[PDB]
Amino acid sequence: MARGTFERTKKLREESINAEPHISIERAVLMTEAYKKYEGSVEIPVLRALSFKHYIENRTLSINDGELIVGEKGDSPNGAPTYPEICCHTMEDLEVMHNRDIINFSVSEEARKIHKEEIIPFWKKRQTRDKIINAMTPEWLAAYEAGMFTEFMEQRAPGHTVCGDTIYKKGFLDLKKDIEARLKELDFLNDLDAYNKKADLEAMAIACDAMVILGKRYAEKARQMAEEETDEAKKKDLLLIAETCDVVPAHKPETYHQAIQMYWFVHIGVTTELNIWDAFTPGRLDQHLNPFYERDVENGILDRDRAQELLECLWVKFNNQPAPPKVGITLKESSTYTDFANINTGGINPDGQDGVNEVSYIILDVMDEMKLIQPSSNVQISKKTPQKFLKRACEISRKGWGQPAFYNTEAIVQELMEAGKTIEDARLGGTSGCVETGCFGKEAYVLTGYMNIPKILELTLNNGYDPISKKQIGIETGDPRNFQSYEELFEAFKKQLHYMIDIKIEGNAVIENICAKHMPCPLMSTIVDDCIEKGKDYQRGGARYNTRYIQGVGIGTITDSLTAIKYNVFDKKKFDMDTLLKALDANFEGYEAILNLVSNKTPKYGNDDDYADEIMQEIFNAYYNEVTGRPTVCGGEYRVDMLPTTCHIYFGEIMGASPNGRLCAKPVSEGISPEKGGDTNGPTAVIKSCAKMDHIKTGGTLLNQRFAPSVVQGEKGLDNMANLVRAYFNMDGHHIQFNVFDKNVLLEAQKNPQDYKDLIVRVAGYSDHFNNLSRTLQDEIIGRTEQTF
Ligand SMILES: O=C(O)[C@@H]1C[C@@H](O)CN1
C-alpha cells in the first residue's frame, strides 16, 4: 500500500526514494564539447545558450515507468549533473563526495575517468571558482578559511529565484517572438548598451530554441516509446505525454496537465543551465493551476483525482532532483540533498483576496500523501485565509515531518514593499528556499553567504584575533578588558561587524562581476520579468527587482552572549571581562560558576524578556544597518535575511566558547530561534520575542518551533497550532515551522539509523531525513525546546 493515492504515483514515489544519489557526467561532457566548438567565437552569454542548446539537443532523456510529468536533470532520478564551469572538481573531490558519510554522491568509474581526462584538463582553469578564489583578497581568504562567512557562489550559480506566471500564459515560441521583437527594436545608434542587450537577447532566443527542442524531443521519445509499448494503458499515458509535449514548452499550456509539464520542463532547463541555488519552484502553484483546474473540470477532461495524481507526479519529479554535489564549505553550509524547491500554497491571489482555492486543497492532500522532503511544500497564511485551510495545514504539520512551513502572507507582502516592490508585484510574491522573500518571476534575490555573527563577537572579544585559526582575522578594536561600558563593547562589535561585512561585500562585488560575466543564464532570463524587455540577463540585473542577501546566522547565540556580558560584566558585575575570556579560553573548564551564571541566571532571548530581546534588536539592527542599502554591482541593493540551513553547525564548529554558555565547537543557534536552552517560557513567549525582530525590514527570518506530540492532538491541538501561527503572524512574524517528534524515536534513530530511513525532521527552512544529518546537527535538532501549549 505505502504512499501515493494512485498506483502510478505509488510506483513513481517508490522509484524516487530508491534512486541512488550519483553524479551524471553527461552534462559536463556535452558542455565541454560545446565550449571546444564555440568558446572564443561568441560572447559568453551566447556561448552559455549554445552550450545549453547543444546539451538539450544531445542529452539522453528518460521517461520513467508510469510518469505523467516527464523530465530529469541527470541520467536518472537522483542523478546530479556536474557543473565544471562553476566548480571543476579535483579527483580528491570526487573521492570525498563518493566516500563521505552523509550527502554522498556515487562517482562511477566511467564518470571519474571522464572527469579526470576530459573535464579537468579543460575546466580546471576555466571554472569560476578559481576565478573567484584567485581574485579574493588575503583578508577575505583568511576570514573565509576562518569561518567568518561563507561564499554562495564558489560552487553554485546565484539562482535563488521562483517562477512567475509567464510560462502558463506564453510558450517559448511566444517568448522567442518577444525576444525577436526586442532584437528588431534595439537602437545601436543611441543605445550604447545595445551590444550587451543584443548578446543577452540572442542568448535568450537560443534558450527558447533549446526549450522548444526539449519538448519536440520528449514528444518524439514518448511517441517512439508508445510504438514499442505493449501495455495499452501505458501506451495511452505515453500518448498523453506526447500530446502534452506537443504543446509545452513551445506553446502556452492549455490544460492543467500541460501547465504542470510546462513548469517541470522550465524547471529542468534552468536547473541544468546552471547549478543554481534553490533549484526552481512554481511559487504560487495553486494560483497558477486553479484557472486550468476550473477550465478543465468544466470541460470534463479533468477531475479532482486526476488533478491530484498529476500533482503527485510533479512532487516525485522534484524529489528526483538532488542539489548537485557540494564539497568544502558549501557542503558544510548546505549539508543536504534537497534543493529548496519552495512551493507557496494558499496566501492571496493577484487581486489581494484570499487565494485558497480547490487546487490549494489538492496541493495539501498531495504533500500529505507523498511525504517527500522535495519539494519544500509550504503554506502562506493570510489574515484572509479561511481557518479550514490553516487548520488543514496544521493537520499536516503536526504529523511531524516539518512540512508545511507557515509563511505570513501579510509579512511577505510588506517585506516586498519595503524592498521597493509594488503592491501589485508584492501580491505575486512569497518565500523561496528556506524563508527567502521574493517577488516571484520578477526578482533576482541572491543569497551571497552566511555571516558568522557570533564569531564576529568572538573576534571582538579577542581584539580581532581568531583563537580558533590563530590568525588576526578581524581588526584591532581594543582589549575588551579596557571597555568600561557595554555600549563600548557593542561599538567594538559593530566595528568588527563593519570590517567583516566590508570584506564580504568586497568579495561579493568581485564575485557578482564574475557571475554576471561568466555565468549568464539566458534561459532563466526568458521567464523572469524584465529581462527580455530590458535586454539584460538575469545574472546582470535583468530582473525587475534585484536584491542581494547576506544571511545572518546565530542571532540567538550572539544575543545571549552579548546579554550575558551586559548582565554579568557590566550590569551585575558578577565577573569582569578578563575572567570571562579566561573562562571562554578554557571552554569553561574550571569556571563552573561562570558557566552556570550565563546559562541559567542571565536573561535569555526568546522569553518575551525585553532585557535580552532589546539586545537582539540592537544586534539585528546593527546587522540590518551594516548590510541593507549597500549597492550591488548590477543596480540592486543588499538586504538582510536570517536563515542558517546547516551553516549554524559549521559556524559553531570553527568558533570557540561564547559568553552565553555555548561551548567551544558547539553549533550556534539556528534561524532566529532561541539559543539551546534559552526559551523556558513556552512558544507564546518565543513568538513574542521573535516578533520584536523587524521581519518586515528583512527578506525573511526562520523560526523553528518544536512541540511535544501530545499537545498537538485533536481539535484542541489544531486550534492551538492555528492560534500560534496566527498570533505570531498577527505580530508580523514572518515564518514558523514545526517539529513534532518523539525525542526517543530520534535517539533510537541515531543508535540504529538503518531502522529509521523514513525519519524526516525539520532542519532549517526544510525537512530532511534524520540520517542525512551529522551527529552534531542531529543533536542540535534534539536540543531544540520541546514546547507545550
Ligand atoms: O541550500 C541552501 O543553503 C539554500 C540557501 C538558501 O536558499 C536556503 N537554502
Numbering used by the authors: 1 to 789
What do the paper's sentences say?
To obtain a Hyp-bound structure, we used a different cryoprotectant and included Hyp in both the crystallization buffer and cryoprotectant solution. In the active site of the Hyp-bound HypD structure, electron density was observed for the substrate Hyp. To investigate whether Hyp binds to HypD in the Cγ-exo or Cγ-endo pucker state, we modeled and refined both configurations of Hyp into the electron density and found that the electron density maps are best fit by a Cγ-exo configuration. The Cγ-exo puckering of the pyrrolidine ring orients C5 of Hyp in closest proximity to Cys434, prompting us to propose C5 as the site of hydrogen atom abstraction. The distance between C5 and the sulfur atom of Cys434 is 3.8 Å, a typical distance between the site of hydrogen atom abstraction and the catalytic cysteine in other structurally characterized GREs. Hyp is positioned in the active site through a series of hydrogen bonds that include: Glu436 of the Cys loop, Asp278 of the β1 strand, Ser334 of a short α-helix between the β2 and β3 strands, Thr645 of β8 strand, and a water molecule that interacts with Asp339 of the β3 strand. In HypD, we also find that Glu436 is positioned to hydrogen bond with the hydroxyl group of Hyp. However, in HypD, the Hyp hydroxyl group is the leaving group, and therefore it is the leaving group that points toward and interacts with the Glu of the CXE motif rather than pointing away as is the case for the other GRE eliminases. In HypD, Phe152, Trp277, and Phe340 are in contact with the substrate, with Phe340 positioned to stabilize Hyp through a proline-aromatic interaction, which is characteristically similar to a cation-π interaction. The close proximity of Asp278 to both the amino (3.1 Å) and hydroxyl (3.5 Å) moieties of Hyp suggests that this residue could both deprotonate the amino group of zwitterionic Hyp and protonate the departing hydroxyl group.
